[PDB]
């Protein structure tokens, strides 16, 4: 769920999870266009991951799941079902991805109007 998402992103660092609430063309509810940068790419991959989970019959934005933060690293589990495995994997992946990026203030609250209609394919 969103609580775990914010949690994992905050565990790995280096900035507040709120910094990605609405950024570029993909960080924030929905999203389309050409990713603006590395961070926007992480959100693109995350959206893709969430779509895959939804197709797997899960609820990425609501179901909670257990996990641990150790030395700024996310450890997933224990999982009670396959969905908790999937969700934690998505969040763990965007957290790691996001952790390796530089922040571009110019994309904070970027107008979706400036984002293209089409989007790159999902892996
Ligand atoms: Ca999004």
Curated annotation (Swiss-Prot):
Q: Reaction(s) catalyzed by this protein?
A: a 1,2-diacyl-sn-glycero-3-phosphocholine + H2O = a 1-acyl-sn-glycero-3-phosphocholine + a fatty acid + H(+); 1-hexadecanoyl-2-(9Z-octadecenoyl)-sn-glycero-3-phosphocholine + H2O = 1-hexadecanoyl-sn-glycero-3-phosphocholine + (9Z)-octadecenoate + H(+); 1-octadecanoyl-2-(5Z,8Z,11Z,14Z-eicosatetraenoyl)-sn-glycero-3-phosphocholine + H2O = 1-octadecanoyl-sn-glycero-3-phosphocholine + (5Z,8Z,11Z,14Z)-eicosatetraenoate + H(+); 1,2-dihexadecanoyl-sn-glycero-3-phosphocholine + H2O = 1-hexadecanoyl-sn-glycero-3-phosphocholine + hexadecanoate + H(+)
Identify the catalytic residues: 46, 91
Tell me where on the tree of life, at the top rank, the source sits: Eukaryota
Per its UniProt record, the required cofactor names are: Ca(2+)
Glycosylation: which residues? Answer: 71
Where in or outside the cell it occurs: the entry states:
Secreted; Lysosome; Cytoplasmic vesicle, Secretory vesicle, Acrosome
In what way is its activity controlled?
Inhibited by methyl indoxam.
Please tell me where Ca(2+) binds in this chain.
26, 28, 30, 47
EC main class here is hydrolase
Q: Which GO terms describe its molecular function?
A: 1-alkyl-2-acetylglycerophosphocholine esterase activity; calcium ion binding; calcium-dependent phospholipase A2 activity; phospholipase A2 activity; phospholipase activity; phospholipid binding
Q: In terms of pH, how does activity behave?
A: Optimum pH is 7.4.
Report the record's Gene Ontology biological process terms: arachidonate metabolic process; arachidonate secretion; axon guidance; cellular response to leukemia inhibitory factor; cholesterol homeostasis; defense response to virus; erythrocyte maturation; fertilization
Q: In which tissues is it expressed?
A: Found in spleen, thymus, peripheral blood leukocytes, pancreas, lung, and colon. Expressed in neuronal fibers in dorsal root ganglia and in peripheral tissues including stomach, white adipose tissue and prostate (at protein level).
Q: Which UniProt keywords apply?
A: Calcium, Cleavage on pair of basic residues, Cytoplasmic vesicle, Disulfide bond, Glycoprotein, Hydrolase, Lipid metabolism, Lysosome, Metal-binding, Phospholipid metabolism, Secreted, Signal
Question: Cofactor note from UniProt?
Answer: Binds 1 Ca(2+) ion per subunit.
Listed EC numbers: 3.1.1.4
Q: Name one GO cellular component term.
A: acrosomal vesicle
Q: What is its main location?
A: secreted
Q: What does this protein do?
A: Secretory calcium-dependent phospholipase A2 that primarily targets extracellular phospholipids. Hydrolyzes the ester bond of the fatty acyl group attached at sn-2 position of phospholipids with preference for phosphatidylcholines and phosphatidylglycerols over phosphatidylethanolamines. Preferentially releases sn-2 omega-6 and omega-3 polyunsaturated fatty acyl (PUFA) chains over saturated fatty acyls. Contributes to phospholipid remodeling of very low-density lipoprotein (VLDL), low-density lipoprotein (LDL) and high-density lipoprotein (HDL) particles.
- Similarity-based family: Belongs to the phospholipase A2 family.
* Protein name in UniProt: Group 10 secretory phospholipase A2
Q: Could you read off the lineage of the organism from its UniProt record? A: Eukaryota, Metazoa, Chordata, Craniata, Vertebrata
In the complete protein, the residues contained here run 43 to 165 of 165
